[PDB]
Amino acid sequence: GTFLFTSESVGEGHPDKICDQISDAVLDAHLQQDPDAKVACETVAKTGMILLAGEITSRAAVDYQKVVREAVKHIGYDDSSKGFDYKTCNVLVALEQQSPDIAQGVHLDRNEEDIGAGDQGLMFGYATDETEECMPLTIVLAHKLNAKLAELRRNGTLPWLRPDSKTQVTVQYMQDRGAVLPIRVHTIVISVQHDEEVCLDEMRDALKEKVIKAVVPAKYLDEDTIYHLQPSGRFVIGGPQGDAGLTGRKIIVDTYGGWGAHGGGAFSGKDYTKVDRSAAYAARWVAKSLVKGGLCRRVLVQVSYAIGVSHPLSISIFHYGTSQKSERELLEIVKKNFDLRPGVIVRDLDLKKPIYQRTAAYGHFGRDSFPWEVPKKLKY
Amino acid sequence: GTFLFTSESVGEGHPDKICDQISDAVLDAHLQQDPDAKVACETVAKTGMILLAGEITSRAAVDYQKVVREAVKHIGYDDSSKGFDYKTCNVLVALEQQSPDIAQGVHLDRNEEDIGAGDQGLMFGYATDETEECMPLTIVLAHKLNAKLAELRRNGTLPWLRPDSKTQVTVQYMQDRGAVLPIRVHTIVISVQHDEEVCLDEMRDALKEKVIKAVVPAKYLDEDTIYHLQPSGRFVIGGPQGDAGLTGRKIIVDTYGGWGAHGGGAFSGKDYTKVDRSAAYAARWVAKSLVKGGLCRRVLVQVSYAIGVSHPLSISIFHYGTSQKSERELLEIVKKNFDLRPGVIVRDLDLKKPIYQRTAAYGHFGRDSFPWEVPKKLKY
Ligand SMILES: C[S@@+](CC[C@H](N)C(=O)[O-])C[C@H]1O[C@@H](n2cnc3c(N)ncnc32)[C@H](O)[C@@H]1O
Numbered sequence: 001g002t003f004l005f006t007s008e009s010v011g012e013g014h015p016d017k018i019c020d021q022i023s024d025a026v027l028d029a030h031l032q033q034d035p036d037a038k039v040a041c042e043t044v045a046k047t048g049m050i051l052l053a054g055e056i057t058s059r060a061a062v063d064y065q066k067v068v069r070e071a072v073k074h075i076g077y078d079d080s081s082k083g084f085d086y087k088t089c090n091v092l093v094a095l096e097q098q099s100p101d102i103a104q105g106v107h108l109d110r111n112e113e114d115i116g117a118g119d120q121g122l123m124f125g126y127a128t129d130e131t132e133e134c135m136p137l138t139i140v141l142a143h144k145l146n147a148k149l150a151e152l153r154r155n156g157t158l159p160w161l162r163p164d165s166k167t168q169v170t171v172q173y174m175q176d177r178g179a180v181l182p183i184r185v186h187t188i189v190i191s192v193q194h195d196e197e198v199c200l201d202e203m204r205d206a207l208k209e210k211v212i213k214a215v216v217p218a219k220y221l222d223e224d225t226i227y228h229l230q231p232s233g234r235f236v237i238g239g240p241q242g243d244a245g246l247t248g249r250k251i252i253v254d255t256y257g258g259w260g261a262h263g264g265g266a267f268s269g270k271d272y273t274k275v276d277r278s279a280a281y282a283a284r285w286v287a288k289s290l291v292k293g294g295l296c297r298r299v300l301v302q303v304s305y306a307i308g309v310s311h312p313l314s315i316s317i318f319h320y321g322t323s324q325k326s327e328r329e330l331l332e333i334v335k336k337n338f339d340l341r342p343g344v345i346v347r348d349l350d351l352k353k354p355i356y357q358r359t360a361a362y363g364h365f366g367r368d369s370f371p372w373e374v375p376k377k378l379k380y
Numbered sequence: 381g382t383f384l385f386t387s388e389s390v391g392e393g394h395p396d397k398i399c400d401q402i403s404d405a406v407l408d409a410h411l412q413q414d415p416d417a418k419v420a421c422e423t424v425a426k427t428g429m430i431l432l433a434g435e436i437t438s439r440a441a442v443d444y445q446k447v448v449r450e451a452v453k454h455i456g457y458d459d460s461s462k463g464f465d466y467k468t469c470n471v472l473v474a475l476e477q478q479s480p481d482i483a484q485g486v487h488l489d490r491n492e493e494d495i496g497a498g499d500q501g502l503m504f505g506y507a508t509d510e511t512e513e514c515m516p517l518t519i520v521l522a523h524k525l526n527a528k529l530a531e532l533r534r535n536g537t538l539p540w541l542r543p544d545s546k547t548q549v550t551v552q553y554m555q556d557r558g559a560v561l562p563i564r565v566h567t568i569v570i571s572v573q574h575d576e577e578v579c580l581d582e583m584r585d586a587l588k589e590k591v592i593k594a595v596v597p598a599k600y601l602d603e604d605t606i607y608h609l610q611p612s613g614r615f616v617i618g619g620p621q622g623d624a625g626l627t628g629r630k631i632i633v634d635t636y637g638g639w640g641a642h643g644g645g646a647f648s649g650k651d652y653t654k655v656d657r658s659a660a661y662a663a664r665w666v667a668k669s670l671v672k673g674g675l676c677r678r679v680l681v682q683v684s685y686a687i688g689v690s691h692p693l694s695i696s697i698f699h700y701g702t703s704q705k706s707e708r709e710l711l712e713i714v715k716k717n718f719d720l721r722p723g724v725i726v727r728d729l730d731l732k733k734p735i736y737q738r739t740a741a742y743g744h745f746g747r748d749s750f751p752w753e754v755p756k757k758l759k760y
Pocket residue numbers: 014015016164165166191192232233234235236237238239242243244419420435436478479481482485498499687
């Protein structure tokens with residue numbers, strides 16, 4: 001009954017992730033002044049460039065040059081030696097108002113509770129009892145390895161580290177009546193951008209001793225665990241100079257690491273009317289409520305919408321055989337306890353609050369007790 | 381045992397899809413001259429602009445202005461009245477060589493069969509016996525509805541149609557020992573860009589009579605089927621003018637429509653060394669071979685890689701309880717029949733051939749008998 005499963009994560013300076021963080025810095029800057037801002041901000045990053053493209057209709061007065069540069073500074077790209085510098089990069093803006101055809105069909109003259117979905121689409125929520133935070137261990141460990149790299153870079157322990165990193169964790173699991181039980185870590189990959197001076201052996205030793213051992217419990221590591229540390233051999237060129245980044249290109253890192261499913265929508269740079277974000281957060285909230293409520297050990301929830309229509313078109317539950325209740329019964333419990341109209345989700349999850357840049361690295365789920373991470377007490 | 385499941389698809393003129401098609405037109409233009417081109421071409425589209433950003437190392441001489449404009453012409457954006465025009469749009473290029481640090485770690489001085497994966501990552505393949513092509517009915521129908529719109533636009537039946545469209549199909553299924561059986565179509569959404577002259581009732585009638593009835597079998601449609609046709613009410617502004625598009629933002633439309641799983645990687649604009657594409661195609665090939673080989677009714681396959689390492693780090697099989705054989709036994713069959721090194725996949729799936737622009741709309745799977753759609757005869 002054993003099997004392997006792999007998930008990855010990336011650091012704050014991974015170019016796709018830079019884009020997600022900038023998109024959400026822009027969203028938060030708008031929401032700080034106009035809680036009802038309509039934002040659809042895409043970011044593109046390549047050598048020396050941040051380009052903002054999309055549609056924003058807002059009463060806020062936002063200084064895009066300042067917001068973008070401050071986000072890049074926070075990430076740690078502050079010198080041409082690192083391949084990117086917030087002080088001297090090009091910031092280009094191609095932002096227009098939201099299409100009036102979309103606005104009239106979604107929200108104009110609509111009661112907030114009855115606002116229409118901002119687009120059609122499908123979204124999934126997932127939760128698993130394998131960790132207290134109800135997330136897959138593979139992705140939790142992968143995120144923590146990138147967070148550890150950023151911690152050691154920022155406190156000056158490993159000053160040769162640069163912001164761009166990727167990690168990947170393969171866990172060997174046992175199947176248990178549809179639930180999954182982590183046994184051991186089979187393989188770890190770490191690739192991180194570095195300075196010109198540090199040698200490969202010094203990096204590999206530090207990645208094992210100061211990063212992996214500082215994150216992964218020893219009980220999961222053994223003589224057979226495979227380590228791929230700086231497997232490319234050299235990673236001096238990094239960030240946007242090494243690879244063009246775009247918003248919404250790390251949607252699996254943002255969610256469940258391959259577990260569960262995804263509807264395709266990106267989160268960053270979007271206000272609550274874009275159900276790609278708000279309904280995915282609500283679906284996570286439902287899934288976690290079902291697991292913490294003791295109704296199943298793991299569960300997948302799907303929801304879908306049509307543009308301009310408030311109520312979801314469909315809701316579905318897949319419990320992997322981990323409940324005594326049928327999926328039909330769980331769906332009835334969900335329908336009695338949740339209202340997944342976007343105009344209700346916004347109230348329940350406080351989605352006009354400018355906390356979005358905090359979600360844009362290290363995953364949107366399983367951290368920091370955001371509203372979608374606080375289970376709802378279910379009545380049935 | 382009944383449940384609902386929803387999938388979406390988009391048309392050739394959806395702005396994200398325009399980007400995927402342009403990225404793959406660029407890839408094919410390079411491969412026509414240099415079969416070993418290293419391509420990582422991202423495209424961004426917004427009002428009046430196509431921007432190419434990324435990394436290409438190739439011996440080809442490619443006229444980016446001509447390649448981009450020809451792709452936009454094919455899609456049908458040929459007049460400012462449509463919101464976008466290949467003849468007069470801005471084409472901007474920010475393309476540099478592939479990072480030498482990546483090149484040295486992946487492919488330089490390597491025997492082709494032993495080339496390293498171009499990046500780390502995870503990829504999934506899926507197949508289901510619910511259709512002959514081994515794809516979920518939800519996504520097959522959603523794709524065919526967009527293809528029908530483009531057919532009626534191009535033959536002049538519905539001259540008010542414009543290239544940008546989205547569709548969404550919800551099917552009611554029955555569960556059958558882990559397999560899924562389509563019963564009926566519960567809800568259909570169609571949104572399509574249109575001219576200023578046509579009225580809503582004429583469009584809704586045409587979408588039902590000339591589009592849905594021309595695609596979806598009557599046996600699936602009944603008095604209860606819900607139709608959301610032009611639900612926003614007005615969609616004159618469309619294409620990149622209505623919404624910024626980016627390459628790799630329709631990864632679920634490109635694959636399984638919410639069924640199965642996704643590793644996060646985009647396909648378009650990437651040569652075979654980028655396992656996000658080649659290993660996902662090979663995983664589809666494995667999954668379809670297992671279903672057509674009669675070993676399971678539906679199956680999910682995961683593979684993963686480390687940058688610079690040829691052999692996958694992990695391979696896993698989830699058969700949803702639809703095989704008499706254990707997942708351990710199916711994994712042994714896969715390991716005896718397939719070699720998922722990128723330098724072998726390229727040979728088996730002929731991945732230096734310039735057929736990629738053909739994959740960039742209507743899904744990469746379940747169509748046209750591409751090599752990954754031709755099952756391998758399994759020996760065990
Ligand atoms: C390998 S690059 C993607 C392929 C690239 N676009 C190309 O031109 O081949 C993807 C990510 O891997 C990381 N990366 C960049 N250079 C790397 C290197 N030399 N070694 C390992 N990882 C690298 C960065 O996080 C980057 O965003």
